[PDB]
């Protein structure tokens, strides 16, 4: 009942990203394969969206293009370590209804103090590498 795909996105020179609270770093579009008609992007708020989330990095999956009115999808995000291995993930508890231009994600994906702590190895060589797995419900 689902078609599963994944995507990685490396944000080089992460410490040079000057985005403040409410601002966004956006990935290029991606899809499940060359024949896929859907287009998706990731959007990261490195200092959250508002005062109550400013201590988190927020991460969203955005449906950029789809042929019909809606797409239902489950999704999971993780950060890759220096070996390109998944660390902790955060995964949606169900499929969510996307329409063109709609996002779903986690406002509190990771605490900034955890992300920035050298002990955790999440910014190797000043790169933030995000990994997204999506399970698209087939219509």
């Amino acid at each position: 009942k689902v078609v599963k795909f994944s995507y990685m996105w490396t944000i080089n020179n992460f410490s040079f990203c000057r985005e403040e609270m409410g601002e966004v770093i956006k990935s290029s579009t991606f899809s499940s394969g060359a024949n896929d008609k859907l287009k998706w992007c990731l959007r990261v708020n490195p200092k959250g969206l508002d005062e109550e989330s400013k201590d988190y990095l927020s991460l969203y999956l955005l449906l950029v293009s789809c042929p019909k009115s809606e797409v239902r999808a489950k999704f999971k995000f993780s950060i890759l370590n220096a070996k390109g291995e998944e660390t902790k993930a955060m995964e949606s508890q169900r499929a969510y209804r996307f329409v063109q231009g709609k996002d779903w994600g986690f406002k509190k994906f990771i605490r900034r103090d955890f992300l920035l702590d050298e002990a955790n190895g999440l910014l190797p060589d000043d790169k933030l590498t995000l990994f997204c797995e999506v399970s698209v419900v087939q219509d």
Binding site: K88, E91, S92, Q93, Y96, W104, G105, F106
Partner: peptide
Amino acid sequence: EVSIIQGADSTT
């Protein structure tokens, strides 16, 4: 790895 299963939110 560990996966924390959570409700999603939207910015709209």
